[PDB]
UniProtKB/Swiss-Prot annotation, chain A:
It comes from Listeria monocytogenes serovar 1/2a (strain ATCC BAA-679 / EGD-e). Keywords: Ribonucleoprotein, Ribosomal protein, RNA-binding, rRNA-binding. Disulfide bonds: none annotated. CDD domains: S4. One of the primary rRNA binding proteins, it binds directly to 16S rRNA where it nucleates assembly of the body of the 30S subunit. With S5 and S12 plays an important role in translational accuracy. SMART domains: Ribosomal_S4 (SM01390), S4 (SM00363). This is Small ribosomal subunit protein uS4. GO terms for molecular function: rRNA binding; structural constituent of ribosome. Residues 91-169 form the S4 RNA-binding domain. The keyword Cell inner membrane does not apply. Residues 21-42 are annotated as: Disordered.
Swiss-Prot record, chain B:
InterPro entries: NA-bd_OB-fold, Ribosomal_uS12, Ribosomal_uS12_bac. The gene is rpsL. Residues 1-25 are annotated as: Disordered. With S4 and S5 plays an important role in translational accuracy. This is Small ribosomal subunit protein uS12. One of its GO terms (biological process) is translation. It comes from Listeria monocytogenes serovar 1/2a (strain ATCC BAA-679 / EGD-e).
From Swiss-Prot, chain C:
NCBIfam families: S16. GO terms for biological process: translation. It comes from Listeria monocytogenes serovar 1/2a (strain ATCC BAA-679 / EGD-e). Keywords: Ribonucleoprotein, Ribosomal protein. One of its GO terms (cellular component) is small ribosomal subunit. It holds the Pfam family Ribosomal_S16. This is Small ribosomal subunit protein bS16. The keyword Metal-binding does not apply. GO terms for molecular function: structural constituent of ribosome.
UniProtKB/Swiss-Prot annotation, chain D:
GO terms for molecular function: rRNA binding; structural constituent of ribosome. HAMAP family: Ribosomal_uS17_B (MF_01345_B). Disulfide bonds: none annotated. One of its GO terms (cellular component) is cytosolic small ribosomal subunit. One of the primary rRNA binding proteins, it binds specifically to the 5'-end of 16S ribosomal RNA. The lineage of its organism: Bacteria, Bacillati, Bacillota, Bacilli, Bacillales. This is Small ribosomal subunit protein uS17. The gene is rpsQ.
Length: 199, 134, 88, 80
RNA sequence: GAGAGUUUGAUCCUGGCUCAGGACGAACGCUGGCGGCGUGCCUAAUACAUGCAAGUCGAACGAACGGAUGUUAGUGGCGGACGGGUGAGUAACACGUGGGCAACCUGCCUGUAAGUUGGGGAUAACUCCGGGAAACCGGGGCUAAUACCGAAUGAUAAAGUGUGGCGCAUGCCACGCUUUUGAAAGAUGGUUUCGGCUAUCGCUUACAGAUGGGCCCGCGGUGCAUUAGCUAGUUGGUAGGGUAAUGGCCUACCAAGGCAACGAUGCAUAGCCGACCUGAGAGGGUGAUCGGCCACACUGGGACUGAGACACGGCCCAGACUCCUACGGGAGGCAGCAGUAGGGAAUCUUCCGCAAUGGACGAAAGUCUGACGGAGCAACGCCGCGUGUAUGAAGAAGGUUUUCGGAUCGUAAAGUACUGUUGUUAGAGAAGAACAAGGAUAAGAGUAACUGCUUGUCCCUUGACGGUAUCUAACCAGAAAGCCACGGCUAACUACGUGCCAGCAGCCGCGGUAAUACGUAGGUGGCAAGCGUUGUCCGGAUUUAUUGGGCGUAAAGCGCGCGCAGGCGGUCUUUUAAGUCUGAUGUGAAAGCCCCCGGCUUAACCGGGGAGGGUCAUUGGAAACUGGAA
């Protein structure tokens, strides 16, 4: 994708499973590289807050410029800044793809929507950065329906959230209602981020 | 102060000095008069090249060149990196930056811009010191 | 002269037009006297908004349209209207 | 009709021929440090008969230009 | 409204220096895939090689060409004063905002009311002569007009006036009488009877309007007092002339004023604003691109023409600079678009088209337009997308390291399955386009009626971009990742080599044989088609403190007084409304910030609507406080 590198070392560096559920980490949770099993160090205020940012933006897999533009755009919305930012960051299309689970991870979802194997409101959308809102359907192009990657990746679904619907007979789903920081996974603080960008 | 004092004379802030005065002056041969223009870099001609003994605490020899810039100001420029191509009447491009070891130097030579051929054998920070990628 | 014409605005390969009152002399996107509508040729029905009372007024003062502004007025029914006010 | 500008002030000199100079004196706010400052501004009044004198309170009003400097006219003599 | 590091043996304060953010018309170094939107001589207002940027009308006119249409070199009309460029000058009514003109203009546009009557004289073109290479110049002769000049009738133009209604002194508006002036033109087209009539495009007079300009004015916005006096048509007045118009605008005569410490005069600097960047805000800096206004077109001055100029691509003259010559004599001004040289750290193609929008001309077809649409180049910026996706181990080969057991690069690879955003190949192929003109007709006003005019509806029509976007299929993981840092400040550590050497460094500071601070390798962190350095601006910096600082010892109380000016001023009553406060009206352009909607596959971007913004002005009210008065 945008990031074409390996996957496990990021989760290891951050001390959190991202891009999976314990896949990367339950064997050697320690940090990658020459160091990490031999020694550890106490991590500063800056480093903690940064690492929180990293846990967001490498969970979703997007450039930092794009990430901060999304931050500032979410800043307009009336509410708690980081909550609004987390929910809009979930409101990206890549999220909705991966939650429907036609592909096993964010990067695969991005690849799918990059090649345009899905269609919003019936129409084509070839960008991972589209913003879905409440009531917009999504499909599998009527042409990418039988392909083995999707057929085999729909075999797994960890749990369908309560803010999405999906009909696999159609391969058609939709966002129901915007989450509010409890529907999502909650292995983050949404405040150290705004600290790090406010200093 | 009193408000009447502040009205009889308002405040007056500080006169800022530049790190790089000679980059902030242009020239026209016609008028023969310097013209204030903010500039990042200037090119010049090395009058002299040599070594310096730096301040306490340090003792290593520091490579400098006394340059006559495009605008006529004579300036001492550090020659950073291992080895160089330069000699008398050598053309050189010059950026700002203060050698804290060395008293009379305030500017650096951009390495790799002109007759300042890049550093030998360098692999890291290559964009500094001006070596291509191999 | 004083003319009723189009002010080009928008972006490249996607024009939009404000319907404007102006002298012949002033530039195409320069100053104006009053703007009184908008225009878009891209859409299947071209989308026109006109105030029509100020427009009748500027015509009575002698602000003449362009060709395309004339035919926008006529397809909005304003040139018939202005003739009807010239009947008396 | 549209209406013209009128002011009030005090006379400083009489040496000129069929005119005076009226000094207007207003407090006003210094732009930055907020204090009120005595702003003064003198004008040349068109005195049709050399009526007024020095020390006189007076009202004037503007009109067409009448000299290099004059643009005003005597309207009343409010208080000697 | 965030702070961190740095003085000390350590501490507290003070105080400076630097840093963490944001922004650039940027340059440079390393690297480099694409799409969309934008931006791109800031320096030498230095000089110009070349090409194109202002033409048009044959329905104004005469001649020539022509087998009746059409063409032209000329005379004439309009436009050339727009559009386009730059920011030199300019510290001022130049600009912004708000008013005033009873003191002013205005072609082309609209409408209203009248009128285009009769004649004259030439002049180009042309032909000859002479000059000159030739253009091109003169001299003679011929000639047409919507070119010119007369007249009669017509001024809401003057002069003499009288009445009505009024204002803001100068005065205004309306009406009527007398006297004196001031005009013109035709062309096309139809019809009629042949005289006539008559539509349209033009012409003349007056009135209104709209639009565009002009003059005046209040206030506002830059540093210097190591610049305090300046002015002599300078200030006012009476007469006179002048401008589209008021006015020392100018002239003559009289008086000697006028401005100025509320900073005049002078020096240097600068186009001004909307607005842009930053900032909690006050404020700080800027005045690229977009819009408005101003100024200037090699430098200086001057006028003519014209509604409009003292004219970018006009004239004259002086000056500088340059070019061609047949060497006699001619011509010229890129700060128009490209481009060239030079300068510079540095900034584009000597491109296509008038399809569109808009302008000039024309009755229109049409022509002209380097305006403008577009395309090209530059990673210069903003946005977007990639450079594969999944699965795959106690974990290959190799690298680094080893506490020689291992640890790490690392699910990375390999292997298997899948996809085609992009790339390629072949196919399709929109918008943008409205029209105008012409051909039909239906209704009007006006006509003796036709022509014509205005309006309604149909038909027809023309795309540079461009076979570009967009869309369909097929094929391929295949061809698409680099930059910086890792002692703290601040994210991210080991090995070797060096040995106060080589070298690093924004501040503190590292390196003298065991360097996480140098060089390299591995690994890591931060970013990512960009990263970093340099230069500049704000903040942090309460480090110029109005908000928002201080002077015993840290920097800082004149050594002390007498006192002009100014600043500030005890208690009460009345009066006002200079300041203050307040209701109404008007405006503060669009674009931009902000909010709400919509559209481009989202975004950037674009559109619509609203809001905000003034020590804004007029008008009308209150008297508590400041100020004025008794
Ligand atoms: K004068
Ligand atoms: Mg200047
Ligand atoms: Mg501040
Ligand atoms: Mg001209
Ligand atoms: Mg020119
Ligand atoms: Mg040019
Ligand atoms: Mg060592
Ligand atoms: Mg002291
Ligand atoms: Mg606005």
């Amino acid at each position: 994708a945008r990031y074409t590198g390996p996957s496990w070392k990021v989760s290891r560096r951050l001390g959190i499973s991202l891009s999976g559920t314990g896949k990367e980490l339950e064997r050697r949770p320690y940090a990658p590289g020459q160091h990490g099993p031999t020694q550890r160090k106490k991590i500063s205020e800056y480093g903690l807050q940064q690492a929180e940012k990293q846990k967001l933006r490498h969970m979703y897999g997007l450039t930092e410029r794009q990430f901060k533009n999304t931050f500032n755009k979410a800043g307009k919305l009336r509410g708690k800044h980081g909550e609004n930012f987390m929910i809009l960051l979930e409101q990206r299309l890549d999220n909705i793809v991966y939650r429907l689970g036609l592909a096993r991870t964010r990067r695969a979802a991005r690849q799918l929507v990059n090649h345009g194997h899905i269609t919003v409101d019936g129409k084509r959308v070839d960008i991972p950065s589209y913003q879905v809102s409440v009531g917009q359907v999504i499909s599998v192009r009527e042409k990418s329906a039988k392909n083995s990657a999707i057929a085999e990746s729909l075999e797994v679904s960890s749990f369908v959230p309560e803010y999405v619907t999906f009909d696999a007979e159609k391969l058609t789903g939709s966002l129901n209602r915007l989450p509010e920081r409890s529907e999502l996974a909650a292995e983050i603080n949404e405040a150290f981020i705004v600290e790090f960008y406010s200093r | 102060p009193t408000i009447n004092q502040l009205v009889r004379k308002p405040r007056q802030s500080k006169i800022k000095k530049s790190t790089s005065p000679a980059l902030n002056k242009g020239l026209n041969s016609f008028k023969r008069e310097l013209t204030d223009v903010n500039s990042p870099q200037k090119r010049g001609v090395c009058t002299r090249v040599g070594t310096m003994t730096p301040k306490k605490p340090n003792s290593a020899l520091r490579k400098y060149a006394r340059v006559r810039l495009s605008n006529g100001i004579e300036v001492t420029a550090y020659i950073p990196g291992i080895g160089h191509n330069l000699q008398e009447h050598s053309v050189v491009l010059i950026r700002g930056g203060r050698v804290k070891d060395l008293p009379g130097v305030r500017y650096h030579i951009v390495r790799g811009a002109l007759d300042t051929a890049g550093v030998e054998n360098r692999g890291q920070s290559r964009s500094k010191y001006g070596t291509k990628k191999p | 002269a004083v003319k009723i014409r189009l002010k080009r605005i928008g972006s490249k390969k996607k024009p939009f037009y404000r319907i404007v009152v102006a002298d012949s002399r002033f530039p195409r996107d320069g100053r104006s006297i009053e703007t009184i509508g908008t225009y878009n040729p891209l859409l299947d029905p071209v989308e026109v908004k006109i105030d029509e009372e100020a427009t009748l007024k500027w015509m009575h003062n002698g602000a003449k349209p362009s060709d395309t502004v004339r035919n926008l007025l006529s397809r909005e029914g304003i040139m018939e209207k202005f003739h009807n006010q010239k009947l008396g | 009709r549209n209406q013209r500008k009128v002011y009030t002030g005090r006379v400083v000199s009489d040496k000129m021929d069929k005119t005076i100079t009226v000094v207007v004196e207003t407090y006003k706010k210094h732009g930055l440090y907020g204090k009120r400052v005595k702003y003064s501004k003198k004008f040349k009044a068109h005195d049709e008969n050399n009526i007024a004198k020095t020390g006189d309170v007076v009202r004037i009003s503007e009109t067409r230009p009448l000299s290099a400097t004059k643009h005003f006219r005597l309207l009343e003599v409010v208080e000697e």
